[PDB]
Curated annotation (Swiss-Prot):
The gene is FABP4. Gene3D superfamilies: 2.40.128.20. One of its GO terms (cellular component) is extracellular exosome. It comes from the Eukaryota. Changing residue 24 to D: In a breast cancer sample; somatic mutation. This is Fatty acid-binding protein, adipocyte. InterPro entries: Calycin, Fatty_acid-bd, ILBP, Lipocln_cytosolic_FA-bd_dom. Monomer. Homodimer. Interacts with PPARG. The modification Phosphoserine is found at residue 14. Transmembrane segments: none annotated. A motif (Nuclear localization signal) lies at residues 23-33. Forms a beta-barrel structure that accommodates hydrophobic ligands in its interior. Belongs to the calycin superfamily. Fatty-acid binding protein (FABP) family. Signal peptide: none annotated. It comes from Homo sapiens (Human).
Length: 133
């Protein structure tokens, strides 16, 4: 029942500062422009201890499956090869990505009927709001 309130299909309804977040992470111009237009569907499911998070969009489809606290390999939508660990901290899913001596954290939170995604790289934060599809 660990992530019951996250489970479901969610659609992006608003974004703030995502272009700047992508710049901070290292994404190049053309990818930022195409990726920034996307309105992904985020689909979260749980089977036993395995959580799956899919992102589906016209830009790229991604899927990750993981156990909380157990590191895994991820290829991000912008083609970074990262080492990721996702934990639950006070009801927030905290996703840390490490690569090339850098780090970024993506937090996913249930707030009212929304799922709020906050992405941070050094001083740069982006907030992405999702609603039920
Ligand atoms: O899933 C989302 O809303 C946002 C936010 C969680 C981060 C990554 N993300 C994406 O969309 C995927 C992406 C696009 C270009 S680089 C990476």
């Amino acid at each position: 029942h660990m992530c019951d309130a996250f489970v479901g299909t969610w659609k992006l309804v608003s974004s703030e500062n995502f272009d700047d977040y992508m710049k901070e992470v290292g994404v190049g111009f053309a990818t930022r422009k195409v990726a920034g237009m996307a309105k992904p569907n985020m689909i979260i499911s749980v089977n036993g201890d395995v959580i799956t998070i899919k992102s589906e969009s016209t830009f790229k489809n991604t899927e990750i499956s993981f156990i909380l606290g157990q590191e895994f390999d991820e290829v991000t939508a912008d083609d970074r090869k990262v080492k990721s660990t996702i934990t639950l901290d006070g009801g927030v899913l905290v996703h840390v990505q490490k690569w090339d001596g850098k780090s970024t954290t993506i937090k996913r939170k249930r707030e009212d009927d929304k799922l709020v995604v906050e992405c941070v790289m050094k001083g740069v934060t982006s907030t992405r709001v999702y609603e039920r599809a």
